[PDB]
Amino acid sequence: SIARHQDDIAIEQSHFYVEKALQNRRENSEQFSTTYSFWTDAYVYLGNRVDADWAFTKNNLGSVLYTTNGYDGVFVIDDRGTRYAMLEGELSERSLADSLNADTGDILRSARRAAVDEAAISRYVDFDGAPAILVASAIKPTSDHAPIDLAKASVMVFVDRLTPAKLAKLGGDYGIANLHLLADKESLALEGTPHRLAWVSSRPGSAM
Amino acid sequence: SIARHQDDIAIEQSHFYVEKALQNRRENSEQFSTTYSFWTDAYVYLGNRVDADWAFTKNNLGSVLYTTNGYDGVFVIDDRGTRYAMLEGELSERSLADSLNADTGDILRSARRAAVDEAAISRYVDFDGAPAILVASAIKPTSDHAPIDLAKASVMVFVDRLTPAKLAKLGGDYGIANLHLLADKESLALEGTPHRLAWVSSRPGSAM
């Protein structure tokens, strides 16, 4: 019983699908993160003292995470701070704390707590001045193992930097035209970052 | 310069987003599959003779794949046939060949061939009389290992059965109302299956 402008309904659907594009992507990464962190061998080789031979040289948590999966940043963090860093597929001594506006200890605690329900955490971050999706899950062995103390559990962090091409492809996956970072056009703020995502206010859907 | 019926444009967008929902889901599963199959330990423990202790009892390829990730069927196949089967998180001696309308050897060869480009395969199947997404990738060790012969490579298969609840949640993720299996309403055929997916012909987008 309520009619709407063609240009307006376009704008409303287009916001819904950009937001869905971010939520679906973020939620798939969460499950990816638990797949790598709820892993007995990971707990063995990264839970205390990280083995960069097993992780990077033997490619159990290595460059493929960037070259295939798109995680610009892969980290292992504990109470001391960043224990493993792989930035664009290459090993780094750079900390997560320097790479992000978010706090290492907040992400550590949030991830340790949701591991009790077998869940990961996620949020948006500023990563080297660009928008990014962050997921993290506690490094935990599987149920056959003895009960560990999650309070000292190390946490795995995957950072997905929303570069121009990835954003471009992301919009196409959801019927959005010219999804980009904002330097007439729709936009939304990425909460937790200084960045806004923008696109042309049109009818989302097929090319047709 | 071309105007359209409100009911018609709704129908066109709704098809686009159901098709996107299947494509995005299928493509995330493909990358999930290579994450588990392009894995040196997997090649060691599943490439010849499957170790159900390492796979199921030690939860390296175990029930979590169903209870968390949603893969109703997890298989390891070689030239002899099904070497490992986990159906709804529980170990089975049932073959993939009995579970699907698709052919074990076609899926084996397709997956072996695309492993050369570091890719997986995917398609829709009839799984116990229900629609399903199938992904598969060759079990291969990582680049540091010596060149293996993919011609004898075993292949990992993840089957995602599109049950009522999963379909229901899938539609909500894309703005579709009442996405269901077909026993007035829109529908599309799942090519490679006898099944059609149906939904109410309305304006896809937000609840608003």
TrEMBL record, chains A, B:
Entry superkingdom: Bacteria
Cellular localisation: Cell inner membrane
Record's signal peptide: none
Protein name as catalogued: Bifunctional diguanylate cyclase/phosphodiesterase
Upper lineage: Bacteria, Pseudomonadati, Pseudomonadota, Gammaproteobacteria, Pseudomonadales
